[model samples]
Target: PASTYRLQISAEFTLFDAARIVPYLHRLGADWLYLSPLLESESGSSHGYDVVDHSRVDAARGGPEGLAELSRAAHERGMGVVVDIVPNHVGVATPKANRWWWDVLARGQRSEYADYFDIDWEFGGGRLRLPVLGDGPDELDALRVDGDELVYYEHRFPIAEGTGGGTPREVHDRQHYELMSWRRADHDLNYRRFFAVNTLAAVRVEDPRVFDDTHREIGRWIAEGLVDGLRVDHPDGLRAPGDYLRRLAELAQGRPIWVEKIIEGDERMPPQWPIAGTTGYDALAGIDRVLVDPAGEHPLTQIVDEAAGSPRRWAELVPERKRAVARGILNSEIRRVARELGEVAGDVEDALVEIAAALSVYRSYLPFGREHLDEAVAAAQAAAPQLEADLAAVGAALADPGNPAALRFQQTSGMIMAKGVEDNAFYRYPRLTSLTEVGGDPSLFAIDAAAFHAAQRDRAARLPESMTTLTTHDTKRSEDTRARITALAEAPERWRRFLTEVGGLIGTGDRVLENLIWQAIVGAWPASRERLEAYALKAAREAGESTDWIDGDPAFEERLTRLVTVAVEEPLVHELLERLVDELTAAGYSNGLAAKLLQLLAPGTPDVYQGTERWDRSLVDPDNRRPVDFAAASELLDRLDGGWRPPVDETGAVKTLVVSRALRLRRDRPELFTAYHPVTARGAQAEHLIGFDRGGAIALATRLPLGLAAAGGWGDTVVDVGERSLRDELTGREARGAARVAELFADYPVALLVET
Candidate 1:
């Protein structure tokens, strides 16, 4: 793999739509047309993760023919295709749309597809619980038979053979499913689901036959060369990700594969898993941290704590929220694991939840990641010495890969981690919102140059072909948005003063959450009020303080809604926001360019998220999945190719220059990036810059740009570029061994120097 350009393929932007962008991507120097899931997903699914069928590409997303066309266009331009595949679960909203789910519901244990899903047959007495009714079992009148299917309004389920003769209630009572109130889904759902979403049903893809059944279409892709590689979605959710990957590797016949795995702290990928490496959240965290200001941690924490009227430690809050998730939204998963634990479950149930919550990382693959499990157990035991025996027993059982209790616990723990940390805790923590990104650790504020260099060296040596990216469809904020927010770290005092004045005006009832919201507003300033409102509403609900998904707090929510509107609408507040945007915009651009250079030139197959070649300040999906303006990008590329050098202005043509120059350089000369070495800069303000040599080319970018500007703009700084003459790729200027940093960054804050 050379470099990837990710495209979010959906019903609106089908494969045919993406086919038209192949030439644009190729011209932009992307090697592979990296894509979101194109498999059959739930109707109107813009993000495509809720895959319903594995037998074919989604008809809504243009199916096989469209992919063939897309592949043809890509191949014609010497580009390849890499698609995201969801092996952990499938969409079961309308059961009929998923033949496997429909068969299981209709025939229960007697169906050929019974073992295909990861359903707890004994938990609900061999009956799958369908939480589809408006009011418990009493809402039987809503159930109506429609051509051999059971319909509760829009939701459709399969009816077992010869069970539809009686009235709707009678027929339903005879089926192998219990139609309960939708509210009971949080605890009573018997089948495994994707995180807290009840609609996505987990499948037992670890089974050999199940793997074959699910990978039939994917196998076709590999066999026919429609796909060059695979990006596995949420591999932690799989019962045995290593085994699944091994099988997938065999199916794809040694093609490159990347997992959407987020490792905590210094955790590395399982060496046994036959894949390249992770899809780039770890890389994302590294880049963000290198650009962040550690000095801001205390001041930002002070502001957040003071605004919220109390101190909240992110370190102590992690396990607490994770435990809350274990006992709250993920109670069903906990119960399922305990039930699988059998005889000792009555004694160790709560202990099991605590042990799971104490896990520092998402999960451990037994026999490989035993240390993480042991560490989690020790932590839990230390906290609750009373549950020592129970923790020990559960830990012992979890260490065994073959034990049913272990398998269930392993599967359940990942769900707890995601729901607890990413969804629940991330929203509640307000010290620094940018640090709360997908793979980002809010507790660890900043990483210095030496640390960033070590990680890159490790990455280059460990997995050179692995994917390294800054933004994705699932990111909380776009790369540029995050880069801008990261700039807040450089001037925490200024941020504190601004918040002190503006914070008094926009009270959403929950000041901590409001702090986070304001950071988002300030980060993505000049955005439409609707976009801001949508983001604010999501942030507040996910935080679950003043408002939540289950019965929103009306009075507080009213204030929250008004707060979003007034954030940009009100006179004084809007003026403050505009002023702050003006203050931070340049530094944000500087940080954005730096982050882009660091990620693109890093040791891995870097991926470019759609439309991010420019300054796209997207906020999570479906905002991040918005259509790409390739025509505009193509014109800009044409201009750059036509001997035009764009200015570092609001137009973001400078960002495109950085992306195109780095990508084309990497593609045209892969050997130049075979080895990674830190390029040293000597001066009074040397700490504010990061430069690295990729064997044949040199890359440098400005970090802590605000601090650099305050220190009087690189007065006499100089960089050591090894005994070689080079030319600045951005400006076409010649350079010697020791180059003046001031002259080097005279044109732009970042420089890409190729050997002359």
Candidate 2:
């Protein structure tokens, strides 16, 4: 299958739960049922990314029997399953849960499982530091042997041989792992972790034995035809991504496998890897850019700069934030790189910081030689002339073909970039928030229609089978939320006025964060107070200005609470929020419909992230991963199937119709999507219309809805679709040759015309 739709399931929403939704999924036109990680994970894990065991389907998520039943049901409906696998890291949230990690902790380097993990035992002084207890070693001293394991309150781990005799405190001193304060982990830890997440430790999957052990059950599933494809989670985190992917490719045996890779600006997939393509962040970025108004950049920049009283260019801000992450949450990783530097000139820490900051993209295509590494070193040297000599050594090490330090630095750089930019800077910089998405640079603003077309042509020619998506579990804000926020760019004057009024109503000290909060408020308007508060608190903490993850600032929290409460609860604030929501939601709906149609008909294999078939105005993690209301979507879909063309409204039925029709067309008439061609709009407001022809099926979408409205609603824009009798898939209207926008978009803001 060329197209697949992803459904994010967790233990809470198990395999059995998904089994009940197959009829609805079939009607919704999903070719494959893409699942999150199904392997046994931490207890009560909502999302399944934290795998504790890969040997079995999670009992909490209905175990092996549940997966088997779900597979059988999917096959019955002519659908296949693609499971997400996290081979790069595993959950060590509970010591008892991860047997391998526990065994290594109890047995040190002598343990058979020690080599399976990516731990630097030499750096740990022959003992791993497990940051579990509350304050210090005293907490470890307070623990009791209880049986074969040491216990401190609810926490427990095994005691090594012959070390359980003395007092629990004395016994703890002799174990392979040392217990320390949880707060010191960011700076003092030694293990290679996933981002800054201490509970998830990296694995040494480059070893053949490690790879075989981790992937055995998954291979069995594929061999038995229970799974059709594999989605590799975070390939960039691995020490040797190419080697791991090669092994995975052998196990998968040419099944449609893709990696969850994030491509920064101008970066491409390495042709050497044995996979189809990335899981669509690049496509997501490209698709989002064309819908935004480039003209709004200056106005938005002016407002943001004036409010914050400073310019925050990404070139300067990103490096500063990278240094902060290096000094802060990722201190352990930086220290590891420094130790690997092995007697260098200049400040070792400073040199390593410069090297990590210098990385242009995630990790360089190492097998492709030194082009990317050379560029990174040059950039680093240019940025800090004083550290030229030190950085040269660092660069030489990273560029070397055989140095283990090179691979370690390469693997760590991307994590630094993600934590620094996406998590830290994205929250701090509040210009056009829509540009702050993963794989998107806020500094770039927007792309023109020509650039969008070029990207599509490249995609079709280079990797036609790659996934194209608008929303995903990792998106900073859901597609509709971003779509709505993008509309704010068109009316900066009005936005300024609203901000002034809202600031007066509920003023805050942190003006930059104030700007971000307003964007989020408008972005996910009608959101519950609890959801908004959680998102706001997380955003502020991540920004690390007034409050942060490791430390707290009550003053900042109080002010944030006041603003959030007023925005959602106060009468005057509600009046403003409601009015803004009303105007933005209408425009957002148009933007949503247009983007949905384009993504479905675009060059790559379009993915509909779970609940995105309808309106998905969610923000970040727990927000985006909220359960789907299949009953409501199914009811609307059933009516549409029965020849009903319901009126468009905020309930998102119209968007569902567009998604269903475009997807069914892609599935049924796969031949019609073999070629990629851009269709030119001819009329007064030609710029407002984005049209493209995929073989015989042509897609027309409205860009900048506010601009469209201001220019008097499409104004006779027409697209020439080859003089053949064509049917508008959305409205069931028939047109020959040139179709006027006024007629085609009468029922909706988009049209998918298929040649009869």
Candidate 3:
């Protein structure tokens, strides 16, 4: 028998209440429970990505004992615990006691641990950033530094009102902490941070003592047998990936270690880093190929070209638009490259320009996928033909020029989106990573099934056999939100209608697309129409558009206000979004089923994101952060039998049905799930239906948008089961009509074929 299938659950909840879900997770074949950081943080933080105290679990999460008991119960079940630990930053919103920070603030360079953070103490050093906790005008009175405590005074301090003379106020309210922020970054406080994030300050983790302090609880958990594997967050940000992983491996004592590394599809994981493998979004190439039709490739490319037909002329049409700060930031990066490369700077500059130009085409009307990256890289190489020669000539001098030209090169290609979108940006929407959102970065347009198999083969020797995923607490939109968006991508005409109706309420056609995209990415809502109108009018006036047309008349704000108010008040938009999501779910169910079957039977272990057992179309931020429905998930999970094998059933249900079926199959066929050989099918429908028989059981799934199969082309016989077609364990009936199979899987982008 294959090793017992172990499931990992990524959770976002109070550490204490998170324990409440333990029983449910335990019963569902879960071997390890994965949770977001439970460290003390700013109150009401749903994702816990912003941590305050490394040593302590948040009191709201039932404190340390709450974590201990949960771990104890999990241990009793022989289940390991995994936590999403963030050592990079501490929650600096408004420090309550401010133990470590207050000390650093007072002593400046004199503090014992002054070198612990990424700060500049000298004049050349960046400004010290502080979070203003108090209300705007009331801040001056609040900014009082009493010895070690920098107290932001509040009027509501529950003190003896009559004794206001010369007596100092005692620290009274346990829950009330001081906040000091109106701006997000680069304050006069004398410190620089990662990006412009003032609250999330980067730490010097490469320092030994710093590493020990940050990883203290993590080490304790592993030593106590409360934790097993780890999914390291953003190892790329570290100074040395190798040293960090080596220490992690040592600390883990061989506990499974999967770094959130983002190497391109063809690029290799950094050699010699003692890591199991990467969290596989970089390997998400296969998803692209199936979603985009190969035959439609040229047509889609043409559509994209036509859509962006006249760049200069197009801008003239949208006369009110201005370039965003991000574009300038990208351009300045080339200038930075010029300084770093010196004589070779020109070559780097040309290389970057080519890369940037290639990336520009990926936006708007383009067939986005891996092909974009291939073409971009080729273009970059052509532009800087002497880059190889320059690197050799400069040799070691170019090794660590402190210039991030190479990094920028990597970013313009595909790495930036991966790190910026997936790594750095705390908020994530599913559509950004979904198959339908393929061409956003043309370079990574498609991922072939064969490529997927190859990647698995390459990773067979490394990485834990388990894979982790779900909609995630950090996703930009809920899974359902993306599902709806995918439905729109599947049928753009329908989306056009919805947007057109809403466009009459907005300003421009592009803005209509923009608003709709954001809505689909988050949820349908105008945060504040008056606020939006004021900003738009301000930008319009600055851009030399008619200020009077935008804001001189009260009608403009009134109209925008009414439009926004109406959008929120109306339920039709909600209903519309939900319907589209449902359609996608129906189709996504099959795609998920086919993909998951591959995941289950493939070499690595597959992780099911929390609450993904149901339809998830959450919006960005709060929408994605909405509490999960474990009750619904349980209902689906409960339907699976104890044997862990998929039932021979195919039904028209939410896409979660396929996921449940696939996970069950993984549980049943543990032996077949080993990382080894990957075998494909040969038959008339081979191109249409992709099949893989891991161990003795063969799993089959559809290949829609691949250009071969259309509405009713299922029975074209793309797959030839080796020797003879094996019995499909998923459906009780004998498999015959590929078209029927295609139809059944049509709701999703693909189908699952599993052998008995």
Model 2 clash tally?
A: 0
Q: How well does each candidate superpose onto the true structure, as a TM-score?
A: 0.98, 0.98, 0.70
Writing each residue's lDDT as its tens digit, candidate 3 over 528-629 gives 444333433432232221223213444543554444445545576445544544444444444444445555455555555666555554443444455666
Q: Rank the candidates by lDDT, best first.
A: 1, 2, 3
Ranking by TM-score: 2, 1, 3
By TM-score, how accurate is candidate 2? Answer: 0.98
Better of 1 and 3 by lDDT: 1
Clash number for each model: 0, 0, 64
Q: What are the Cα lDDT values of the candidates?
A: 0.86, 0.85, 0.47
Tens digit of per-residue lDDT, candidate 1, span 326-346: 888789888888888776634
Model 1 whole-model lDDT (C-alpha atoms): 0.86
Candidate 2 structure quality by residue, lDDT tens digits, 87-163? 98989989889999999988888899998888877877788988787864456556888888988888888899878
